[PDB]
């Protein structure tokens, strides 16, 4: 770590994985904190130079900031901050929409005792407040509008035993485009999953049980593949959603 370029690379890869994935990916808690702190300090910095340039100007009708080696640096600061803010905004709003889509599923996950998935890790605190408030508001709306005139036998908005399941869950077999990066950093011999093939670079192997077949993914090729069989590789950065 301790590299501002890698923070931006990680944010971009997280955003790209977020847009194309069906599920609700875990929240990178530390990266967001570091980026928000960096933005907070940087905005203060540009504000400081702006104030310093403004105050001296009015004092004794001095010349403005001399144009050479002056305007372009500060303009670059502003535009860079603008781009970074846009990227984070798009990431946050996309994940908020995905939270909206899967409210009942997340509630059922949180209510289950024997579930390793917990909302304290998968959901940010502000996202927790959003989920709780939106669920209550929607429940109030539906209860006031429709559900009050219904028999006590069926008055639940979540019914897993009815004719049609009322709790929607993510599609675990959606087809996605992936690119095979390989090892996240290097040391191709270190990775145990890598296995060499004939007259070619080492390729990963996966199995499709419903089809009952073995599929080999060669490094440097783009594939259209099921999402479930590639979850571990994406979690370990071996593959990247395009």
């Amino acid at each position: 770590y301790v590299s501002p370029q890698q923070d931006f690379s990680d944010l971009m890869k997280s955003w790209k994985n977020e847009r194309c994935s069906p599920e609700l990916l875990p929240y990178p808690h530390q990266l967001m904190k570091r980026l928000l702190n960096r933005i907070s300090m940087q905005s203060q910095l540009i504000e400081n130079i702006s104030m310093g340039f403004l105050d001296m100007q009015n004092a004794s009708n001095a010349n403005p900031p001399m144009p050479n080696e002056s305007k372009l640096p500060l303009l670059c600061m502003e535009t860079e901050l603008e781009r970074l803010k846009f990227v984070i905004r798009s990431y946050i709003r996309c994940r908020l929409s995905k939270i909206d889509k899967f409210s009942l599923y997340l509630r059922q996950l949180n209510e289950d005792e024997n579930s390793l998935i917990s909302l304290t890790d998968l959901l940010s605190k502000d996202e927790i407040k959003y989920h709780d408030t939106h669920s209550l508001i929607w429940l109030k709306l539906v209860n006031d509008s429709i559900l009050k005139y219904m028999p006590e036998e069926l008055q639940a908005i979540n019914d897993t035993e009815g004719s049609v399941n009322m709790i929607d869950e993510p599609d675990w077999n959606k087809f996605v485009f992936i690119h095979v990066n390989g090892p996240p950093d290097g040391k191709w011999n270190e990775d145990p999953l890598l296995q060499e093939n004939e007259f070619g670079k080492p390729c990963y192997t996966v199995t499709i049980p419903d089809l009952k077949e073995e599929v080999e993914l060669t490094i440097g090729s783009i594939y259209v593949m099921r999402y479930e069989v590639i979850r571990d590789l994406l979690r370990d950065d071996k593959v990247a959603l395009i």
């Binding site: 702006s50 104030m51 403004l54 105050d55 009015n58």
Partner: protein, 93 residues
């Protein structure tokens, strides 16, 4: 909102508008008109002593000015009424 300072020094709004802009236009609210900006100079100059390098005071003043515009419907542009809403604010306390 307080009194007893040294004296109301007069300063031009050019050195006051950046803080008001960042607090109001960017985050929540907008349209600080020129006449409204000049109006918002007098009350902040009433307690002007040892400020623009201070801590919370100016930010809290802008927060309180935003409170009226969330409470009352009002509009977008800020006009010579800006003192008229601070009269309401001092009525509240």
């Amino acid at each position: 909102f307080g009194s007893g300072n040294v004296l109301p020094v007069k300063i031009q709004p050019p050195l006051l508008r950046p803080l008001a802009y960042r607090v109001l236009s960017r985050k929540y609210g907008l349209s600080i008109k020129s006449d409204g900006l000049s109006a918002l100079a007098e009350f902040v100059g009433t307690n002007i002593g040892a400020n623009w390098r201070q801590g919370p005071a100016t930010i809290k003043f802008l927060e309180q000015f935003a409170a009226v515009w969330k409470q009352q419907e009002r509009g977008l542009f800020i006009d010579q009424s800006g003192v008229k809403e601070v009269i309401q604010e001092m009525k509240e306390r």
